[PDB]
Amino acid sequence: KFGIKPEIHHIFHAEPKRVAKPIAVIFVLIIFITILSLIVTWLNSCAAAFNNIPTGV
Amino acid sequence: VHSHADGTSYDEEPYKIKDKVIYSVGFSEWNGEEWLPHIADDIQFELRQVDPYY
Numbered sequence: 001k002f003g004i005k006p007e008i009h010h011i012f013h014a015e016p017k018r019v020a021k022p023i024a025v026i027f028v029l030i031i032f033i034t035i036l037s038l039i040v041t042w043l044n045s046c047a048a049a050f051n052n053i054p055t056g057v
Numbered sequence: 058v059h060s061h062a063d064g065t066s067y068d069e070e071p072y073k074i075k076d077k078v079i080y081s082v083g084f085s086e087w088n089g090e091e092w093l094p095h096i097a098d099d100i101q102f103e104l105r106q107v108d109p110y111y
């Protein structure tokens with residue numbers, strides 16, 4: 001009841017696991033392919049045929 | 058006293074869930090004539106809510 005008492009500490013929790021970065025560079029590369037496929041496919045067909053240009057006043 | 062690891066006091070930046078603090082105290086002993094420093098190997102700090110944590 002009056003001696004010394006043992007010192008203690010605390011136990012934290014593990015952080016959530018991050019994924020390694022040499023995969024995310026590949027997938028943002030794939031997205032950067034697909035969007036340019038969209039712009040090339042619009043300018044290929046008759047869709048983006050700039051012909052009613054509103055010049056004048 | 059107690060404060061942040063750095064100079065800033067508790068009042069200027071109140072504590073977040075986790076960060077670094079320190080704690081200090083001081084002692085003195087009277088032999089009849091002067092106050093002198095008291096040297097003891099063991100003293101202890103407790104950070105309890107209802108149940109000691111540290």
Ligand SMILES: *[C@@H]1O[C@H](CO)[C@@H](O[C@@H]2O[C@H](CO)[C@@H](O[C@@H]3O[C@H](CO[C@@H]4O[C@H](CO)[C@@H](O)[C@H](O)[C@@H]4O)[C@@H](O)[C@H](O)[C@@H]3O[C@@H]3O[C@H](CO)[C@@H](O)[C@H](O)[C@@H]3O[C@@H]3O[C@H](CO)[C@@H](O)[C@H](O)[C@@H]3O[C@@H]3O[C@H](CO)[C@@H](O)[C@H](O)[C@@H]3O)[C@H](O)[C@H]2NC(C)=O)[C@H](O)[C@H]1NC(C)=O
Nearest residue numbers: 007008009010011012013103104105106107108109110111
């Ligand atoms: C709503 O309100 C409720 C009531 O106000 C809140 O409930 C309270 O919650 C706290 C924690 O959430 C409870 O504290 C528990 O108590 C259990 C029970 O142990 C038993 O307790 C009865 C009395 O009830 C006693 O008679 C028995 O002998 C037995 O001990 C206990 O197992 C828990 O571990 C904790 O108890 C302590 O926790 C503090 C720090 O949290 C320490 O001071 C102390 O040493 C002790 O154990 C710790 O365990 C930690 C992890 O579990 C660890 O970090 C520490 O290091 C420490 O010791 C460890 O022990 C393990 C195994 O022994 C080792 O592996 C390890 O290395 C280390 O040695 C409280 O009882 C409860 N109150 C009631 C009335 O139920 C409720 O939280 C709230 N809800 C909210 C907020 O959502």
